[PDB]
Amino acid sequence: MKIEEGKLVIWINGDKGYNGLAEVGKKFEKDTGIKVTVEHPDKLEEKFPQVAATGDGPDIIFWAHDRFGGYAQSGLLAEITPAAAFQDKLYPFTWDAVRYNGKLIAYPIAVEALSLIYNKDLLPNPPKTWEEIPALDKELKAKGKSALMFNLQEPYFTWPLIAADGGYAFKYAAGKYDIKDVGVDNAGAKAGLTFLVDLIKNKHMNADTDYSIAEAAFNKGETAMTINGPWAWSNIDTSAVNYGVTVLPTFKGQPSKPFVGVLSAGINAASPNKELAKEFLENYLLTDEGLEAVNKDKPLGAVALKSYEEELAKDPRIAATMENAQKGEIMPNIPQMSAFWYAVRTAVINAASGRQTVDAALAAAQTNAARAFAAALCRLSTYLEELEAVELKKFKLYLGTATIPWGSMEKAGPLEMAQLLITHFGPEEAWRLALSTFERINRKDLWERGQR
């Protein structure tokens, strides 16, 4: 369905409750006369920035919040302006997840974290540690079963283990993420991925295992454990499996640290239906009845709507989800997240398959994930090199009142100035400040060029 004024087209991932969302859409149409079409395209999170400005994109896009900063930086998302009463209906930390450079860029829907899911009839007492899993697998293999199967093709699922002993994405410090400081090839990351690779070398897991292979094995009663999120509980409910949901195993005595996602709904900046989309999202979806319809299809996790979460929170599966969430980290929403995930996806797949050592794979991922800093630095310095000597002086002065000590800047050339801007404010803010200051020193040419 193409976008047209007077209707809504919604994209949501295929593992979520899209049939439930379509029920909310049908209720909306009943009550307003306005048609809603829910779709679940493959790779929608890659497709959206390719087609967002066209009629072949959606009016509303659902994804975890980590992708949204990149979308907003590219001008793809409308600013969200909820009134006071509506904002108070949702938990503050969920609004935080969708805040980007001081603006709300989506509606938060639900908090997602991975848990350990286990078959109580194969495994009444699940392991508290990763280290126990080889022994468990050995005994289960004797019965033609296995201990653990989960998706090894997406780094989301392996990240909790990589992070446990000290791996991280971007270091948080000074009120921001430092995109130069990447933690994917430190000792902790290496330790975690080496444990994963050792499980595969010792035939306790298969490098080819993906989402569908793991889901089928668990729901058929072939493997004792899997790792997945709340959306997966619906198919297990349907299965004959008596299952539990519990804290992830520790590694080297430390909790597994899943990256926590907030399912979020953004409004296409190019949509002729922005007000229509706001009405649907605020007054039909983010209601008790709306979220229940989606949740009944596939569980959302811990929803952002206080009134409905007070019910869901009593569910032990939700308590476990929140326990794992608290041990993990909220994902950044910065634009560099896409490149981080691609880099780590390649590292895990290459290490797991044996095509690269863990050391080589993570070293390459480190370099790939950090290239965004180098690119930002070189671009900013190249613009600053255009300034005349007197214009650079004025540039440094105005950086005080825009909001770095003058003594730190006085001697600095264009490259050092780019370094200072990015290290102090981060890449996006450094760029915004630079271009803004350009039009303050009569270099609107640079401002114009920088816009393009």
Ligand X SMILES: OC[C@H]1O[C@H](O[C@H]2[C@H](O)[C@@H](O)[C@@H](O)O[C@@H]2CO)[C@H](O)[C@@H](O)[C@@H]1O
| Binding site residues, a second copy, CB under 8 A | 350, 355-356, 360, 363-364, 367-368, 370-371, 374-375, 377-378, 381-382, 405, 407-408, 415-416, 419-420, 423
Residue closer to a second copy (CB basis): 85 or 173: 173
Contacts of 291 (CB under 8 A, 6+ apart): 109, 110, 285, 300, 303, 305, 308
Conformation bin of residue 356: beta by default, left when phi > 0, alpha when psi is -120 to 50:
beta
- Residue 388 in contact with Na ion, rule: CB under 5 A: no
- Residue 346 in contact with ligand X, rule: CB under 6 A: no
Mark the segment that binds ligand X (CB under 6 A) among 21-29, 153-161, 166-174, 201-209.
Answer: 153-161
Count Cβ atoms below 10 Å from residue 450 Cβ, excluding itself: 18
Count Cβ atoms below 10 Å from residue 202 Cβ, excluding itself: 11
Contacts of 181 (CB under 8 A, 6+ apart): 170, 171, 173
d(CA 84, CA 327): 31
Minimum CB separation of residue 328 from Na ion in Å reads 6
- Residue 288 in contact with Na ion, rule: CB under 5 A: no
Which of 132, 154, 178, 323 is the binder for ligand X (CB under 6 A)? Answer: 154
- Residue 156 in contact with ligand X, rule: CB under 6 A: yes
Residues 216-275 that bind Na ion (CB under 5 A): 234, 237
Residue closer to a second copy (CB basis): 123 or 376: 376
Residue closer to a second copy (CB basis): 7 or 371: 371
- Residue 346 in contact with Na ion, rule: CB under 5 A: no
Residue closer to Na ion (CB basis): 397 or 415: 415
How remote is the C-alpha of 169 from its chain's centroid? 12
Minimum CB separation of residue 140 from ligand X in Å reads 26
What is the residue whose two structure tokens read 């295929």? Answer: 14
Minimum CB separation of residue 207 from a second copy in Å reads 16
Mark the segment that binds Na ion (CB under 5 A) among 83-91, 172-180, 303-311, 342-350.
Answer: 342-350
- Residue 309 in contact with ligand X, rule: CB under 6 A: no
Residue closer to ligand X (CB basis): 154 or 416: 154
Q: Count of residues binding ligand X (CB under 6 A)? A: 12
- Contact footprint for ligand X (CB under 6 A): 13, 15, 45, 64, 66-67, 112, 154-156, 261, 341
